[PDB]
Amino acid sequence: ANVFPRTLKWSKMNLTYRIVNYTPDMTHSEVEKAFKKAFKVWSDVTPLNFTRLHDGIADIMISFGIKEHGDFYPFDGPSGLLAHAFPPGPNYGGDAHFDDDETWTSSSKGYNLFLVAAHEFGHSLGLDHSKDPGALMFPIYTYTGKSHFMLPDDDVQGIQSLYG
Ligand SMILES: COCCN1CCC(C(=O)NO)(S(=O)(=O)c2ccc(OCCCn3nnc(-c4ccc(OC(F)(F)F)cc4)n3)cc2)CC1
Ligand SMILES: [Ca+2]
Ligand SMILES: [Ca+2]
Ligand SMILES: [Zn+2]
Ligand SMILES: [Zn+2]
Numbered sequence: 001a002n003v004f005p006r007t008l009k010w011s012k013m014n015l016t017y018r019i020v021n022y023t024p025d026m027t028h029s030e031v032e033k034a035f036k037k038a039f040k041v042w043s044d045v046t047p048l049n050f051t052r053l054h055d056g057i058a059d060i061m062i063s064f065g066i067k068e069h070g071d072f073y074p075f076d077g078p079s080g081l082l083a084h085a086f087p088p089g090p091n092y093g094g095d096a097h098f099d100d101d102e103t104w105t106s107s108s109k110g111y112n113l114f115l116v117a118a119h120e121f122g123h124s125l126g127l128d129h130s131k132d133p134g135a136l137m138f139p140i141y142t143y144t145g146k147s148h149f150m151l152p153d154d155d156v157q158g159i160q161s162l163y164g
Helices: 028-043 113-125 152-163
Strands: 015-017 049-053 060-065 083-085 097-100
Touching: 015 028, 028 049, 028 113, 060 113, 083 113, 097 113, 113 152
Parallel strands: 015 049, 015 060, 060 097
Antiparallel strands: 083 097
């Protein structure tokens, strides 16, 4: 007899990602900057490292889409669902999809791409939603303007339980 494979954590510390396409709301550079910083949230507290591929197959494929966009978990237009992501594994594992019916920003206005991406890459690395309202992995958006960013303790303990 056999059981289904997966799912736990990446068996490798050097992971790749690809920005498959881009939102109109921010420049290529601003989007690239936001995702790089979002990955740095996680590499700053684990031995993980992330490299960007410009084409082809990466561990974490990042894309923007609307409504039904190729996984039968359709987005819903402006508001509501902002994004979703899949835990470590083959094919779709690690991938992160952002709803391009939202207004994405580098500010306290609209929805901050960096912060939402940071949350989603938590999923990409194997974290489900936290019940701690102060956690990055809490499923309610409450990002504010100032000042710097610190990964809350709940998320630090969660990610470090997987990757040390
Ligand atoms: C029933 O099934 C539906 C399930 N549903 C759940 C919701 C969604 C989801 O989670 N997808 O993955 S979402 O897309 O609506 C969605 C996506 C992303 C979200 O970001 C959550 C982030 C929570 N946070 N806010 N601020 C902060 C924050 C943390 C630290 C910090 O530094 C500090 F502390 F100041 F120093 C500053 C701010 N942390 C929220 C919602 C969709 C799927
Ligand atoms: Ca939406
Ligand atoms: Ca993949
Ligand atoms: Zn999707
Ligand atoms: Zn989530």
